[PDB]
Structure formats: structure tokens, C-alpha cells
Amino acid sequence: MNYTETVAYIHSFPRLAKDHRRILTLLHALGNPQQQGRYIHVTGTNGKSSAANAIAHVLEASGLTVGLYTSPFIMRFNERIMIDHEPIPDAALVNAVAFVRAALERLQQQQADFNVTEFEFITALGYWYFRQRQVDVAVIEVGIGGDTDSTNVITPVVSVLTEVALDHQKLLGHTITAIAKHKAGIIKRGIPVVTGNLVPDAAAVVAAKVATTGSQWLRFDRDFSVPKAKLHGWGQRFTYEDQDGRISDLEVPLVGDYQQRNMAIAIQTAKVYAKQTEWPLTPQNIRQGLAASHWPARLEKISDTPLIVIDGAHNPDGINGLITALKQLFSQPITVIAGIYAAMADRLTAAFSTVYLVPVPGTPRALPRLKDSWQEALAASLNDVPDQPIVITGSLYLASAVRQTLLG
Numbered sequence: 001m002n003y004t005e006t007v008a009y010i011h012s013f014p015r016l017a018k019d020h021r022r023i024l025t026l027l028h029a030l031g032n033p034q035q036q037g038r039y040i041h042v043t044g045t046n047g048k049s050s051a052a053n054a055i056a057h058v059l060e061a062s063g064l065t066v067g068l069y070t071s072p073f074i075m076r077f078n079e080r081i082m083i084d085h086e087p088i089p090d091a092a093l094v095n096a097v098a099f100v101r102a103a104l105e106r107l108q109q110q111q112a113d114f115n116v117t118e119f120e121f122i123t124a125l126g127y128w129y130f131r132q133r134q135v136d137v138a139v140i141e142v143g144i145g146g147d148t149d150s151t152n153v154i155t156p157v158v159s160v161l162t163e164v165a166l167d168h169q170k171l172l173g174h175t176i177t178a179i180a181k182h183k184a185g186i187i188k189r190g191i192p193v194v195t196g197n198l199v200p201d202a203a204a205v206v207a208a209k210v211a212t213t214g215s216q217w218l219r220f221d222r223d224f225s226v227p228k229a230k231l232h233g234w235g236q237r238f239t240y241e242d243q244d245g246r247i248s249d250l251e252v253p254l255v256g257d258y259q260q261r262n263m264a265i266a267i268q269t270a271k272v273y274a275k276q277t278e279w280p281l282t283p284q285n286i287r288q289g290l291a292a293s294h295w296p297a298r299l300e301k302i303s304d305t306p307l308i309v310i311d312g313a314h315n316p317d318g319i320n321g322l323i324t325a326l327k328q329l330f331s332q333p334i335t336v337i338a339g340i341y342a343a344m345a346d347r348l349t350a351a352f353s354t355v356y357l358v359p360v361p362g363t364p365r366a367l368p369r370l371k372d373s374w375q376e377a378l379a380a381s382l383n384d385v386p387d388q389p390i391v392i393t394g395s396l397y398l399a400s401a402v403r404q405t406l407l408g
Contacts, residue, residue, distance in 0.1 A: 020148075020150065041154060041160065043141075044162030052070055068139045069141060148185070167315060195219050244271075
């Protein structure tokens with residue numbers, strides 16, 4: 001197969017009953033790559049990808065070759081599997097798919113109805129690839145939950161649980177407790193866990209879990225915190241504090257109050273990793289990693305003149321926090337192009353001068369200022385008020401579509 005056929009092959013896999021027996025069968029065929037090397041395992045309802053990316057950036061700065069298995073914000077497949085933030089090259093992906101396919105075919109020869117899910121195939125490929133390339137550590141983001149996730153076939157150096165919230169209600173459960181219990185599944189015996197300042201129900205689950213595992217638990221706003229933080233350019237200046245002291249006036253080109261938490265989680269986790277592996281990590285490394293970090297489609301200013309911002313804010317509270325973020329960035333009238341119901345559009349028209357409502361591209365258009373597409377809304381705003389800034393937001397698929405179009 002070529003690259004195109006290879007990606008299509010990956011997307012062709014069936015969705016099957018949800019234990020890890022299927023993926024473990026495949027990983028066995030691949031020489032159990034998941035049993036070798038080192039891992040940082042990351043889960044949470046929000047902030048999981050943010051934390052994982054930052055952790056990788058920091059460890060990379062410190063001189064480690066770091067694998068990163070993530071949900072990308074660019075919509076190209078290769079972006080899910082990175083080494084030092086370089087996506088797996090097309091040719092490497094072709095060869096890796098071919099190798100895992102051969103394993104799979106060998107298994108289906110001994111067990112006629114053996115198969116895996118798409119996520120299972122990709123996860124097995126990722127673990128294998130990271131071992132092939134001999135990364136020092138792989139930062140592994142859970143797909144969903146933790147407990148029953150395909151990624152949960154490793155013993156990490158440290159586990160991370162950013163936060164537990166309603167969002168992922170569909171699969172995990174109807175309560176904070178039920179969802180927390182799934183997430184807590186990535187906490188392992190004697191292995192430290194770094195968490196956000198969890199809501200009471202989730203904190204109670206983690207406390208009980210760590211009581212059984214004997215894990216050191218480092219908790220945001222208990223063991224580590226961000227005592228100082230403010231807007232500084234298109235990003236923030238902040239101070240990190242933990243049991244070892246302070247790292248003063250760090251900078252991250254990332255806006256959002258909740259990003260302070262994610263970045264502190266990342267710093268703490270990197271520090272734990274380094275300590276557990278006897279590896280040097282300095283304040284300069286941390287500073288550089290955060291300074292060099294890239295955040296596609298997170299209040300990303302992709303153009304200066306005209307001023308165009310793309311953002312993947314989606315959660316009906318990541319949009320009320322988008323409003324407050326935008327108010328911190330801008331004092332002057334702006335246009336908002338929102339690819340999104342009712343309350344959200346009223347919340348936006350009330351906060352901002354001009355608000356255009358558009359379809360999310362590559363999504364079934366349902367039955368609901370209004371414009372036929374983001375391009376038309378953008379063309380309208382630029383025609384009418386060329387110097388007025390434009391923010392495109394409300395979706396993950398829109399921000400990616402806009403990015404691909406305006407940046408290469």
C-alpha cells in the first residue's frame with residue numbers, strides 16, 4: 001500500500017465490544033513493545049492533551065528523545081504519533097502499517113475471527129514505533145477514561161489525571177464518581193500520580209485509589225501551584241511553586257486561566273519523571289520547553305494584518321471562558337465567526353460587536369447573523385471592516401479546517 005491506502009486501511013477497522021485482550025494479542029505478535037522503555041500516562045476530561053504536550057516539550061528541552069501519542073489539533077493523521085514533536089513521516093507510517101498488518105494477518109491465520117478496533121491498531125502501532133526508534137520516554141494520552149482504555153497496557157514512571165468533569169458522560173458514567181473511577185485505572189502500585197485540584201467526588205476516588213496503590217499523590221493547589229500569573233503578550237507570565245520552591249516568571253505562549261493548571265501539572269510531572277529516573281532537569285530546561293511550545297488552534301493568532309485568530313473552544317464553558325479570554329485580549333470591536341445552541345449564540349452576540357454563525361465543516365448540517373460557511377463570513381467581515389479583528393471558534397473541526405486553508 002501507499003500512504004493514502006495505508007491511512008484508509010487504518011480507518012477501515014471495526015468497532016468491537018469494549019478486556020485489553022484484543023490489543024494484547026496484537027502487541028504479543030509485535031514483541032510486546034509496551035513492556036519495554038519508559039512511559040508517562042495521561043488522562044482527564046479536559047487538559048489531558050495540553051498537559052501531555054507541555055510535559056513532552058519540557059522533557060525534550062532537557063535532552064530526552066520523547067515520543068508523544070496524542071489527539072492532534074492539526075487534522076493530519078501523522079500528528080497523533082510524534083517524536084520530539086515531529087509527526088511520523090509518511091514513509092515510516094507506510095512501513096509501520098505494513099509491519100503491524102503482517103502481524104495481524106499472522107494472527108488471523110491461527111484465529112480466523114481475530115480482529116482489532118481502529119484505536120487498538122493505532123495504539124499498538126504507536127507503542128511499537130516508539131520502541132523501534134528507542135525513545136527515552138513516551139508520553140501516552142488515554143483515548144477515553146483510563147481503566148478500560150486500549151493504552152492501559154503499560155506501567156508508567158508517573159501517572160497524570162488533569163481533571164474530572166461532566167463532558168465525557170456518554171461512555172464512563174452519569175456521576176463524577178463513576179467517571180473518576182474509570183480514570184483512576186491508570187494509577188499503579190507505587191507509581192506517583194500528579195493531578196489537578198479535583199472536585200470533591202473525584203478527589204475522594206483518587207484518595208481511596210492511592211491508599212490502595214501506595215502512590216505518592218501530588219495535587220494542584222496542595223503540593224504545587226501557580227501563585228502568580230498574568231497576560232503577557234499573546235501568552236502568559238507565571239510563577240510555578242512546589243515543595244522544592246519557586247520557578248519565577250516563566251512564559252508560555254498560551255492564553256487561558258485553566259492553562260495555568262495544565263502547565264503546572266506538566267512541570268510537576270516532568271520533575272517527578274526526572275527524579276524517578278535520576279535524570280537532570282533544570283529551571284532553564286523548564287523555561288525553554290515552555291517558551292518553545294506550540295499551540296495550534298488555541299487562541300492562535302494566525303494573521304496580524306488582517307488580525308485573524310482561530311480557536312478550538314467547544315465546551316459550553318470553554319466558550320464563556322473564551323469570551324473572558326477575548327475580553328482580556330481585545331478592547332476594540334471584533335468579529336466572531338462561530339461554528340456551533342441558542343444560548344451560546346446569544347452569549348456571543350451580547351459580548352461582541354459582530355457575530356457570524358456558520359456550519360461546522362465535514363459535519364451533518366442540522367436544523368437550527370447566519371452565513372453559509374466560514375469563508376463567506378470571513379469575506380463579509382474583511383469587505384465591510386478590513387481592520388476589524390476576526391476570531392473563528394466554537395468547534396474543533398472548524399478551527400482545523402480554517403488552519404489548513406489559511407496556513408498551507
